[PDB]
Ligand binder design. Structure first.
Ligand code: HEM
Ligand code: HEM
Ligand code: HEM
Ligand code: K
Ligand code: K
Ligand code: K
Ligand code: NA
Ligand code: NA
Ligand code: NA
Ligand code: NA
Ligand code: NA
Ligand code: NA
Ligand code: NA
Ligand code: NA
Ligand code: NA
Lengths: 157, 157, 157, 157, 157, 157
């Protein structure tokens, strides 16, 4: 097989994180929709779709490298019970995800798998953009108050 | 006459429920417009129109089955005095309506009037969607506060 | 409250007449459709819709004047059993309606509610147009014969 | 084979009913065209085509369930000698068809073949619409007289 | 009646052959579709439709000639169990059909029914085109092999 | 909570089945793409997307009924090693899925949750269409041979 065994392990680890995020964000989206917070529901749906696209790219890369993609192992979804908790749970997930991404990029560089590194760097940039969004939302709750913040997310853009 | 007599009684009971809802929702709509809560007035107008369309389908079915549509009996309207009472009154009415719809479907199934059952199931789905809307609105009043909730319904979409 | 109490009583009386006409004409429409007299069914549907629009305007005016619109009390629907009887019943209803309208306009003029008077005059003109239609139809039954008259109303325009 | 054997027997019974209706309605259509009653000929042609489409759906379902569609058995056509007999013969056929459809739906429900039930319910709704049309036509012959009724069906819509 | 009695018998015989072909080809079409041989299924559907159009023309001619079209008697459908057998069965049917057509044309010429002859000649040309198609398909099975032939008819044109 | 507790258990069981199918079909799709069987990869991708849409509808219904959607439990994926095993594994999964769907519909009917029944019937129809596709593909491998079947799925439609 052409792929480095540890690269493939790293890519399967990142894929596992994507699978958690897909489901966590999809459920959070539909919870916000059920509550009538449609702007949050829509944004979170798009985050879930973005993670689905990252998972696809990882699966394709693992197969090219002649590894076996692991879609069987689903780690812990941490579903919040209110908007603040859901935003914070998403942020905790992305803090974990970006740490694993950096560790994977280090190893790809070490064994000269520069195309896998580039793939992972693109995912990392996407996850840092999500962190920016999440930190901003939690900050806005403090600046405008929770009731106003939720009011501002009732109606879709 | 081709229709089952108890089917026709059930269809007239549902029709009676639709007639209450048409008038209650239409008056609630115009009360919201009078108060300047135009987004609530618009939504409630459309709920009234939807009930008018259900009444039409029931009337057509009753006549096909050679029954007499009952447009004469108008049950009690429970008109609320403020937004929270109006939403809750609509919700109470829909909970009664869906109970009667389920009882009518049971009977249609028993006598093999499958086309009447299908008509009633479509109405039931519409009324459950209205229950979803109403529970969501009452929840938003709690989450964003009454003053913000009303503010968000001043201007039309 | 800004409205004259007796004006509001008159407007609620007219509204009550509109509510009868809405339902009577809607059922007559669907009866003609069930019988295959689609041109009559279509015309009568449009009369029912026109009365719905008059009811809306009355409700809005009553609320502006700080009265309570009465959508609870539904008077007697007189449903005909054949085309001649249905046309005559509609005409009897409009004869009653136009008398109440004239009495309401007299009172509005007396207390200087000229905007309510104008609203009622517009409804009155609409109801006199319906009387013209109804008298014409009953006259055509005599001039062309009942069978030809019904034949001419089988197919929609 | 995946299909329930009695479900397949019921679907073939309905298919047999569709085959009678296709041929009876097609011949009635062309008889009306021969007589110059082109509006009746056109309507009846479309009824024949609708039955052809139902037969197609039944054939497809039977093959999916691994049964043998029965296009070989053609039951009795009851061809009328004049317009009133042809309409009544079509009505008699539809009353038989809807009885068999209800019996088939009962059995599908009992063995949990819910997709076959749904197919049959859609056919049933179509056949009840045809019953509505036929009863309406026979009623119009009484209301406008036979000669006027036929006159109204000379020219196409 | 204006028509020659034996001409009408011949036209009813041809009509009987069309009714067999309609059903045989329709079922063969849907069998090929069930098997995923969609190009064969589509071609055979169009053959069934073409026979339906021939049946229509025969019915119209028989009625003009003041005969009674026979849509009651359905002869034997010979449904094949695999592609080779279905193609050969269709060919056997067309060999029978074209013989009956030639015999009918002889009789039409004899009694000077030249318009019926022309109608039948047009049907005959259509059936010879179908024979050409069928012989060609059976020849291609021999030239390219059965597996390749079926492969080439999986996907629609 | 408005929902029947066993209805919610059934809806979560179906949701669990959808989650297995999403992942199994997505990986099978990308395995086919890796092997250059792009038409199979495309078809299987669309099957995965369809299951995603069913999962969405189930999640929305569970939340409306005030249950907790279970996106955490992922049952066993049975990933095939070649095309014939992958198709058969998908078929085995769909046979399990339709058994569970029928059991869920039985329960919904018993407790009068007719809107949940209708949702499940629509999913069931989709899964039976997939069974039709899968049985057809396995049949084509037998009819055209494995090498031809795979050749026919190299290039996209
Ligand atoms: C038997 C009771 C009623 C029935 C069956 C009925 C039926 C209908 C139908 C079928 C429409 C057309 C809806 C569409 O296709 O969009 C309509 C429109 C409407 N209805 Fe009713 N209606 C009823 C009573 C009322 C009442 C009591 C009111 C007011 C107090 C009302 C107000 C209206 C208005 C404002 C419209 C829209 C008219 C327009 O097109 O401008 N309806 N109704
Ligand atoms: C097994 C019995 C039959 C089946 C399943 C069948 C099926 C069909 C279908 C699916 C269509 C297309 C309809 C559409 O999508 O609009 C059609 C068209 C048609 N059928 Fe049939 N048919 C059957 C028998 C017959 C018979 C016995 C006749 C005449 C005696 C007939 C006359 C026609 C005609 C004239 C058309 C329209 C053709 C055109 O497009 O010009 N069919 N049929
Ligand atoms: C809870 C599980 C999932 C749900 C509810 C879900 C839901 C959805 C929905 C609703 C769509 C839009 C479909 C449409 O309207 O066409 C979608 C698209 C998509 N999904 Fe999922 N999904 C799930 C898991 C996954 C997984 C695990 C993957 C990949 C391993 C995936 C890959 C994709 C892809 C590639 C798209 C198309 C994205 C695009 O528009 O470019 N999904 N998903
Ligand atoms: K605010
Ligand atoms: K006349
Ligand atoms: K080949
Ligand atoms: Na930020
Ligand atoms: Na005001
Ligand atoms: Na809700
Ligand atoms: Na006049
Ligand atoms: Na003629
Ligand atoms: Na009727
Ligand atoms: Na040839
Ligand atoms: Na490759
Ligand atoms: Na199949």
């Amino acid at each position: 097989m052409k792929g480095d065994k540890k690269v493939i392990q790293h890519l399967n680890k990142i894929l596992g994180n994507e699978l958690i995020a897909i489901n966590q964000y999809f459920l959070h989206s539909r919870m916000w929709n059920d509550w009538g917070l449609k702007r949050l529901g829509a944004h979170e749906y798009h985050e879930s779709i973005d993670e689905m696209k990252h998972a696809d790219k990882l699966i394709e890369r693992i197969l090219f490298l002649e590894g076996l993609p692991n879609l069987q192992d689903l780690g812990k979804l941490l579903i919040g019970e209110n908007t603040q908790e859901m935003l914070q749970s998403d942020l905790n997930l992305e803090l974990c995800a970006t740490k694993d991404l950096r560790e994977a990029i280090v190893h790809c560089e070490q064994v000269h798998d520069y195309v896998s590194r580039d793939l992972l760097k693109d995912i990392l940039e996407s996850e840092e953009e999500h962190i920016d969004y999440l930190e901003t939302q939690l900050g806005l709750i403090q600046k405008v108050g929770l009731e106003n913040y939720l009011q501002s997310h009732m109606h879709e853009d």
